[PDB]
Scaffold this active site. Structure first.
Site, PDB file in Angstrom:
ATOM      1  N   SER A 158       0.770  -1.077   0.165  1.00 23.30           N
ATOM      2  CA  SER A 158       0.157  -0.077  -0.094  1.00 23.30           C
ATOM      3  C   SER A 158       0.984   1.279  -0.072  1.00 23.30           C
ATOM      4  CB  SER A 158      -0.989   0.092   1.296  1.00 23.30           C
ATOM      5  OG  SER A 158      -1.921  -0.952   1.153  1.00 23.30           O
ATOM      6  N   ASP A 326      -4.113   8.753   9.571  1.00 22.40           N
ATOM      7  CA  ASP A 326      -3.359   7.444   9.159  1.00 22.40           C
ATOM      8  C   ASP A 326      -1.949   7.594   9.263  1.00 22.40           C
ATOM      9  OD1 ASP A 326      -2.532   5.070   7.765  1.00 22.40           O
ATOM     10  OD2 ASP A 326      -4.245   5.253   6.319  1.00 22.40           O
ATOM     11  N   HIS A 329      -0.067   5.008   5.855  1.00 22.60           N
ATOM     12  CA  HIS A 329       0.072   5.243   4.514  1.00 22.60           C
ATOM     13  C   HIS A 329       0.405   6.655   4.116  1.00 22.60           C
ATOM     14  CE1 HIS A 329      -2.953   1.840   5.148  1.00 22.60           C
ATOM     15  NE2 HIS A 329      -1.993   1.418   4.519  1.00 22.60           N
TER      16      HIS A 329
END
Ligand SMILES: [Mn+2]
Length: 354
Positions: A158, A326, A329
């Site tokens: 990711s 987050d 990411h």
């Protein structure tokens, strides 16, 4: 030498050959579906050729449910335009070509050599249970030599993969920003990374096969995994991780290509009291360093290089390089800085091509 197909039955746009789901491959015409019984005409949410599409009811990289087009041998550029899409990949010649494109009318382009005089493509499993649709195709011949151009094949998760739209996505993997730092006249960049992927999966479920299909001397296999690998649910010990990684490196080296391993950066909040960003023990970094020495591969210690950069800009600004709320990411900005650091490091080591 350009072939343009507008898939669907609703509207046929000028300059495009309208291709309906029931158009069975006809050699006298040079194109059509191999197994029309598993194709269906469906509406799409966009304008022009994006207003309609065909849906692949049967899929998988080895599926015979493809759209075929006879073409003189050589290297071709394929621009793909999907129909209504949640998340899907493109397959051609039995392997993945584009990984996890998202959004209705999603588009991307890739190069592919045609050697048996025919291209066989399909839209396939990205997210199981969603519609795999195709609105249009633009196929342009680049060379009479059916050989790929120099390319950087990227493997990852990711924090490395592509997010769509490619030039507008709020989130991004640094492999998606790589092209903004190397010379396109020197390398093609094929980011095959996928969200939530681990070494075992990258190796066994299609991604490695797709790269081994074309990688050759002169190319680079840029691989960065280890983040998801530490999650217990995958039951992939550091030992297994190291073993699988070793095998992939050997298989790629067996093709004559080179391997560049990268230690994944840490979390946006890995700052100490003294304001120093450190993540030296995350994502099986220890094994990645060892593998670089043992298998003699190139190595970008992005974990340390990125931490140095975060330490130099402070916790507050670093936080602005990751998705809101987050800490794992990176966003487009963070992805861009990571890519910048990566290439800056490749140049410092004087690695051929950078
Ligand atoms: Mn149409």
């Amino acid at each position: 030498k350009v072939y343009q197909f507008d898939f669907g039955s609703g509207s046929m746009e000028p300059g495009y050959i309208g291709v309906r789901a029931s158009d069975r491959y006809d050699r006298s015409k040079g194109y059509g579906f191999q197994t029309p019984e598993n194709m269906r005409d469906v509406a799409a949410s966009g304008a022009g050729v994006k207003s309609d599409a065909v849906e692949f009811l049967a899929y998988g990289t080895k599926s015979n449910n493809t759209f075929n087009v006879d073409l003189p041998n050589g290297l071709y550029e394929v621009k793909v335009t999907l129909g209504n899409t949640a998340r899907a990949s493109v397959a051609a010649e039995g392997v993945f070509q584009v990984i996890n494109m998202t959004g209705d009318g999603a588009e991307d382009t890739f190069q592919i050599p045609v050697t048996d005089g025919q291209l066989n493509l399909l839209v396939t499993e990205g997210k199981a249970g969603t519609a795999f649709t195709l609105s249009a195709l633009k196929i342009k011949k680049l060379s009479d030599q059916p050989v790929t151009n120099r390319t950087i094949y990227v493997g990852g998760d990711s924090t490395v993969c592509n997010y769509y739209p490619l030039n507008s996505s709020k989130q991004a993997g640094w492999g998606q920003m790589l092209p903004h730092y190397i010379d396109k006249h020197t390398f093609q960049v094929r980011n095959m990374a996928s969200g939530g992927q681990i070494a075992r999966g990258f190796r066994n479920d299609g991604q490695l096969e797709a790269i081994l299909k074309y990688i050759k001397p002169g190319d680079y296999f840029m691989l960065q995994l280890g983040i998801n690998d530490t999650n217990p649910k995958h039951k992939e010990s550091e030992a297994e991780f190291k073993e699988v990684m070793r095998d992939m490196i050997r298989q790629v080296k067996a093709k004559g290509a080179d391997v560049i391993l990268s230690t994944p950066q840490g979390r946006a909040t890995d700052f100490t009291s003294e304001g120093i960003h450190s993540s030296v023990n995350r994502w099986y970094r220890a094994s990645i360093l060892a593998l670089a020495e043992e298998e003699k591969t190139y190595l970008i210690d992005l974990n340390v290089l990125s931490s140095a950069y975060f330490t130099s800009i402070g916790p507050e600004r670093t936080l602005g390089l990751y998705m809101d709320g987050d800490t794992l990411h990176p966003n487009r900005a963070g992805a861009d800085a990571l890519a910048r650091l990566a290439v800056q490091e490749l140049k410092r080591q004087g690695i051929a091509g950078f």
